[PDB]
Amino acid sequence: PMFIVNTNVPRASVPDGFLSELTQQLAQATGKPPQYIAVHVVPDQLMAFGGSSEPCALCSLHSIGKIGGAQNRSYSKLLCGLLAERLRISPDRVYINYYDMNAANVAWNNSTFA
Amino acid sequence: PMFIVNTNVPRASVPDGFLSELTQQLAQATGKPPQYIAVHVVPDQLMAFGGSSEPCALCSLHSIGKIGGAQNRSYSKLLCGLLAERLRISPDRVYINYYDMNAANVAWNNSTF
Amino acid sequence: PMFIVNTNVPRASVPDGFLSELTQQLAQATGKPPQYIAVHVVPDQLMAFGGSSEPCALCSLHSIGKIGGAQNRSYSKLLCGLLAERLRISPDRVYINYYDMNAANVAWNNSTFA
């Protein structure tokens, strides 16, 4: 699985250990092994949400399966929760796009997972 | 809806009001209210288009519906137009990918649609 | 075609001809002309792969056709190869997501390819 966060929040407000925490939580939440979890955080971004430049995030989670109605609802609670608690971002200023990737459309290590 | 622009154009060439303009115009164009429009502009990027490093942009627009043949044609005119007029980027150096998101695959506010 | 690389490798370690190289190689590999190829490299990123912050990359290749099982398998070899040699990134720390774009969903030059 792959999680990317884009946010106008400053670099200095991203706590040390945020990436490891995202890794550990996403592992538990998706049921996938941490070695396969990647996380990416892009602060200091020039963005707006609903015309306002108060703290916000635009994120995405890609996975081969482990993506669906119930699962996505659950991930939103978890991840908005973490963006709220660690980055002080209100959950009504967060979008997260989910992508159920086909195994043939994910490369890793000189091949694909198909 | 969500619009992201990535460009090699410098931050200082992005005019004051560009994000608000994109917000207003996307609202009108998609028919969705401005509060639900997000915009993201990433300047100073290391990128090339056709091997040339003259000004260019790689962009994406994500929306739950309001995405299709004619609508996408219309958005290209609008958005290439704005990148041309405000960022001085030639429209033959712009790509925009459109994504019709399923409501279940977009989180907002502790849940999904 | 479009190729984006996101990496924790510093900007100074990205060689100056990397974008042209990616362009030329993707042209040969996809069978499209170099003028249709765009490439984007985002260094200095705050990321982790499998809990570790050693060099890694999250990438994506978008194209209208020229995307599929065998082709993707081949592109992974090529691109991991380039990331290994030029950016000194181990291939087991690379993901590439492939996207077979419908022509109606790609804009260029005031219109779409539909």
d(CA C54, CA C86): 16
DSSP state of B52: B
Q: A1 an active-site residue?
A: yes
The strand order across the sheet containing B111-112 reads B111-112, B106-108, A94-100, A57-63, A2-7, A38-42, C46-49
For residue C114, give the chain B residue with the closest CA: B69
For residue C61, the tally of other CB atoms under 10 A from its CB is 26
Residues A14, A44 contacting (CB under 8 angstroms):
no
Which class for A49: exposed (0-12), middle (13-18), buried (19 or more C-beta within 10 A)? buried
Token reading at A76: 């939103």
d(CA C76, CA C98): 10
Closest CB to C80 among A11, A37, A109: A109
In order of start, what are the domains of chain A with their CATH numbers?
A: 1-114 (3.30.429.10)
Token reading at A80: 């908005």
Q: Name the nearest CA neighbour of A97 among B3, C26, B32, B83.
A: B3
Rg of chain C over all Cα atoms, to the nearest angstrom: 14
Contact with chain C for residue A67, Cβ under 8 A: no
Experimental method: X-ray
C46-49 and A38-42 strand pairing: antiparallel
The strand order across the sheet containing C2-7 reads A111-112, A106-108, C94-100, C57-63, C2-7, C38-42, B46-49
